[PDB]
Amino acid sequence: SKITINIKDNTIEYGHKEFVLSNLQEDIKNLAEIVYQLAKLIEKLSQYEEEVDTELYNLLHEYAIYLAGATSMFIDSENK
Amino acid sequence: SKITINIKDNTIEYGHKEFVLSNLQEDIKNLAEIVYQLAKLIEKLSQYEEEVDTELYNLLHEYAIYLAGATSMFIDSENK
Amino acid sequence: SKITINIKDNTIEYGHKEFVLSNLQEDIKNLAEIVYQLAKLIEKLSQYEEEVDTELYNLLHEYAIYLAGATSMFIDSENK
Amino acid sequence: SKITINIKDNTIEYGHKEFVLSNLQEDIKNLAEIVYQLAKLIEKLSQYEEEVDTELYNLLHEYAIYLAGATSMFIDSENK
Amino acid sequence: SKITINIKDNTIEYGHKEFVLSNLQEDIKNLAEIVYQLAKLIEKLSQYEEEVDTELYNLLHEYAIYLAGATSMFIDSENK
Amino acid sequence: SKITINIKDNTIEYGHKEFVLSNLQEDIKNLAEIVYQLAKLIEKLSQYEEEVDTELYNLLHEYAIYLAGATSMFIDSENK
Amino acid sequence: SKITINIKDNTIEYGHKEFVLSNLQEDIKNLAEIVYQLAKLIEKLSQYEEEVDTELYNLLHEYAIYLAGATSMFIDSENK
Amino acid sequence: SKITINIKDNTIEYGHKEFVLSNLQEDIKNLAEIVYQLAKLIEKLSQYEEEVDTELYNLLHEYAIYLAGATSMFIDSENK
Numbered sequence: 001s002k003i004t005i006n007i008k009d010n011t012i013e014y015g016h017k018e019f020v021l022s023n024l025q026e027d028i029k030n031l032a033e034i035v036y037q038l039a040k041l042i043e044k045l046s047q048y049e050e051e052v053d054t055e056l057y058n059l060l061h062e063y064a065i066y067l068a069g070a071t072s073m074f075i076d077s078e079n080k
Numbered sequence: 081s082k083i084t085i086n087i088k089d090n091t092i093e094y095g096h097k098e099f100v101l102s103n104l105q106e107d108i109k110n111l112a113e114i115v116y117q118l119a120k121l122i123e124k125l126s127q128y129e130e131e132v133d134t135e136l137y138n139l140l141h142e143y144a145i146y147l148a149g150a151t152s153m154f155i156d157s158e159n160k
Numbered sequence: 161s162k163i164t165i166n167i168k169d170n171t172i173e174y175g176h177k178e179f180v181l182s183n184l185q186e187d188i189k190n191l192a193e194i195v196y197q198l199a200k201l202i203e204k205l206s207q208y209e210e211e212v213d214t215e216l217y218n219l220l221h222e223y224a225i226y227l228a229g230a231t232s233m234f235i236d237s238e239n240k
Numbered sequence: 241s242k243i244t245i246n247i248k249d250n251t252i253e254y255g256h257k258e259f260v261l262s263n264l265q266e267d268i269k270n271l272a273e274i275v276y277q278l279a280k281l282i283e284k285l286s287q288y289e290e291e292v293d294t295e296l297y298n299l300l301h302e303y304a305i306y307l308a309g310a311t312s313m314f315i316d317s318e319n320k
Numbered sequence: 321s322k323i324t325i326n327i328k329d330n331t332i333e334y335g336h337k338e339f340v341l342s343n344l345q346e347d348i349k350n351l352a353e354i355v356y357q358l359a360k361l362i363e364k365l366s367q368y369e370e371e372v373d374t375e376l377y378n379l380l381h382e383y384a385i386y387l388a389g390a391t392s393m394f395i396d397s398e399n400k
Numbered sequence: 401s402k403i404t405i406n407i408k409d410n411t412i413e414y415g416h417k418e419f420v421l422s423n424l425q426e427d428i429k430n431l432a433e434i435v436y437q438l439a440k441l442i443e444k445l446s447q448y449e450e451e452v453d454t455e456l457y458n459l460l461h462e463y464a465i466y467l468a469g470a471t472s473m474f475i476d477s478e479n480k
Numbered sequence: 481s482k483i484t485i486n487i488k489d490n491t492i493e494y495g496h497k498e499f500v501l502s503n504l505q506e507d508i509k510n511l512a513e514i515v516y517q518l519a520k521l522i523e524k525l526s527q528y529e530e531e532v533d534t535e536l537y538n539l540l541h542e543y544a545i546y547l548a549g550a551t552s553m554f555i556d557s558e559n560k
Numbered sequence: 561s562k563i564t565i566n567i568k569d570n571t572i573e574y575g576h577k578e579f580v581l582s583n584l585q586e587d588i589k590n591l592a593e594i595v596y597q598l599a600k601l602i603e604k605l606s607q608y609e610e611e612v613d614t615e616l617y618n619l620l621h622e623y624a625i626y627l628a629g630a631t632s633m634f635i636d637s638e639n640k
Contacts, residue, residue, distance in 0.1 A: 064144060270368075
């Protein structure tokens with residue numbers, strides 16, 4: 001199986017959405033915080049919800065993709 | 081530009097490495113923690129290092145990719 | 161306007177759902193943490209999303225309702 | 241039993257008191273933290289006190305009620 | 321003005337109450353935690369309550385007295 | 401046994417030292433933080449030090465006394 | 481100026497004292513926390529004390545030396 | 561075995577690098593936090609990696625050396 005992340009200039013294209021990066025180092029920081037917050041919320045909710053939101057795991061995947069793309073863009077920038 | 085993450089059974093293939101998943105929900109939790117820890121270390125080091133390690137951003141990218149793959153695998157599993 | 165929370169024994173009834181409490185002291189701490197985490201996640205997502213998913217606002221309110229019901233049970237029990 | 245929370249504009253009316261919200265995003269975080277802290281304080285005092293002061297249980301419930309009302313205002317506002 | 325803390329064996333006598341110490345080093349730890357929790361709650365509540373509970377400041381004083389007595393008892397024990 | 405804390409105007413006199421209060425509410429906050437920090441340091445050091453510093457327990461006692469005095473002064477002030 | 485740290489097997493020798501490590505991964509975390517806590521305590525005491533006790537500065541340096549020695553042992557071991 | 565740390569004024573000389581301190585109180589706190597974060601990151605990566613990158617162990621030791629030097633400067637200064 002494949003997962004494909006498309007990158008055009010400063011924009012990530014994935015899952016019928018565009019995600020624009022404006023300040024890469026700060027964006028990377030914020031994206032890492034968001035994925036952590038999502039994972040930790042999922043963990044806490046798992047005590048009560050017999051099935052934790054597909055919504056939260058959808059967001060976690062989406063933001064993980066953005067983090068993966070943003071970090072790639074940064075490394076590309078540094079190598080140039 | 082494209083980023084491609086290859087998945088075969090429980091293994092993510094990327095950047096000449098294999099990353100094997102063993103318990104998706106636990107691995108997702110651990111991976112989220114790792115990317116957060118990397119990002120926060122990068123932030124703290126930026127106060128003293130004029131160039132923060134390429135090593136740290138390389139690791140952050142790698143683990144972001146694994147998180148993006150693991151979360152995709154989980155969603156696929158739940159839909160099946 | 162008016163919000164009504166129904167309590168049958170150790171169960172809260174609200175918004176098409178039923179929520180059972182089993183350890184009030186622990187449940188109150190856990191529910192407060194969940195509400196805090198949801199609120200903070202919405203805040204962080206709002207940096208990037210014009211519209212944060214309605215499901216997150218719904219969860220936030222739901223868990224705050226359970227918390228209000230739990231604290232009611234806690235004081236009634238203490239006075240007994 | 242039934243708990244009733246009255247909301248007039250940005251004010252919550254409950255238990256002989258009125259509570260005015262002014263920044264929902266911030267107030268929700270702050271109120272959740274207060275509820276958590278009250279619950280934890282009661283827990284810790286219970287190590288030494290046969291009876292923890294009723295005022296603490298009352299405050300706990302009061303602030304949880306304000307939080308439930310605040311989150312209601314938050315979602316209504318978001319849907320608007 | 322004077323504040324007088326009476327100590328008899330393992331018991332603190334103050335404010336018409338007796339407070340018994342059973343495990344001094346652990347009690348000191350727990351008492352320090354309680355005074356901190358009280359102070360921090362008072363601080364958080366001060367954002368909303370134009371006058372924060374006399375109750376909370378009463379408890380803070382009481383537990384500060386117990387901490388002061390417990391620490392004295394420990395130092396006395398060590399010197400013997 | 402007795403412990404006596406002497407208070408003259410804004411000054412606590414104890415153990416051949418004077419401790420001057422400047423802003424009661426702020427000083428109470430700071431003093432609570434200090435006793436907490438001392439207690440938690442003592443706890444962490446206990447893993448490596450067979451006898452944790454008498455110095456640290458001396459400081460903890462001293463600052464507990466100042467907290468007990470400051471809180472008393474605040475209550476007296478509020479009653480006047 | 482020169483600082484010398486002597487290491488005999490798993491023991492650090494410095495400033496009239498010997499310090500024995502037993503679990504480098506845990507000891508490094510614990511020592512870093514102790515150093516941070518000492519530094520923060522000195523900071524807080526310096527609000528009220530013209531001179532903070534020399535013992536606290538000594539403990540701070542001592543534990544930082546043990547941490548430097550422990551991290552040396554950690555990398556030597558890893559390379560082996 | 562012997563570790564040697566050279567200090568010229570406010571500069572630490574070690575392992576082909578120079579490190580300049582500017583605010584000892586803040587630098588000590590920040591360096592302790594960096595050391596703790598590196599140690600915890602190594603711990604977490606060791607869940608998944610047979611060999612954690614040597615660079616992380618090197619950074620950990622480096623920052624611990626700077627922290628040991630910084631604390632030496634702090635007490636020398638205090639005694640002066």
